[PDB]
Design a protein around this ligand. Structure first.
Ligand code: NI
Ligand code: NI
Ligand code: NI
Ligand code: NI
Ligand code: NI
Ligand code: NI
Lengths: 164, 164
């Protein structure tokens, strides 16, 4: 199971949103469709920016993703394990939203990032956070959106438990 | 744990070989460096030749791989979780050799074959056949040889615990 830089480290704003009880029956991969980051400091600011965006512009209760993966190869805690994401209408409370920071329509995240996400996925299943036969899906498979990019979609569609 | 077709199904010849100590330290990705089989009637047969090739020609105790994955999206039991392989001189006593059947230098195995390989690793992880901090490597990293081949290599480098 990978290391996860907590909200207390990247400077997350304190909230209190809908809690989520595990295990999750879904693992949904997302991309921010925004800029990427490839170093700690940079990535921490990017998650902070994304959160503020969710609170301020969209008026969401918090960042809409359970976890984020910077191209530094680090996993950043979004709302985390126990709190509900808000990116996939209908699925949020039964899925773990894992999103890569950046725009991967024409190019996939570097290997470091990909490794960390899967390491995170495998972990979650092993520890029962994801169900034994969890379903893996891209944002675009359940929600109408370009997320997480054809390039990235090409990769996760070869991953384990990828919903057909 | 994905379905694994047992030795009895593809017709392995009986043998009693040196068992391996689990969990293993490495997960080694290999390619038969031979012909690619896309349908089961072809793949099953292929696995049989490999075994005879190993027993008959190489005078080895049994087929040299722990598992074999075909493009038919089938995982086949070589010597299994409990018996030492004989594909990596120097590591056969601490690694689990998993080989895709075929050549993959310019192009990697199809999603079906790829997915299976990882679901198998995840299985080993869940069942404890691999250590919590196991290493995933390409045969070429532990043996002077193209095996497994660039395209395939470029892919496993994005898998959990890839010991790049
Ligand atoms: Ni791990
Ligand atoms: Ni599948
Ligand atoms: Ni599985
Ligand atoms: Ni080999
Ligand atoms: Ni040794
Ligand atoms: Ni790594």
């Amino acid at each position: 199971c990978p290391g996860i830089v907590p909200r207390s480290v990247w400077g997350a704003r304190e909230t209190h949103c809908p809690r989520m009880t595990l295990p999750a029956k879904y693992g949904i991969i997302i991309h921010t469709a925004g800029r990427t980051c490839n170093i700690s400091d940079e990535c921490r600011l990017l998650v902070r920016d994304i959160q503020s965006f969710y609170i301020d512009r969209l008026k969401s209760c918090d960042i809409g993703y359970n976890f984020l993966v910077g191209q530094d190869g680090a996993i950043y805690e979004g709302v985390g394990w126990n709190v509900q994401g808000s990116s996939t209408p209908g699925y949020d409370d039964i899925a773990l939203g894992i999103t890569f920071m950046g725009t991967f329509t024409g190019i996939p995240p570097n290997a470091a990032a990909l490794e960390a996400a899967q390491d995170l996925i495998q972990c979650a299943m092993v520890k029962g956070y994801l169900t034994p036969n969890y379903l893996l899906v891209g944002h675009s498979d359940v929600a109408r959106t370009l997320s997480p990019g054809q390039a990235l979609y090409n990769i996760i569609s070869t991953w384990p438990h990828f919903k057909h």
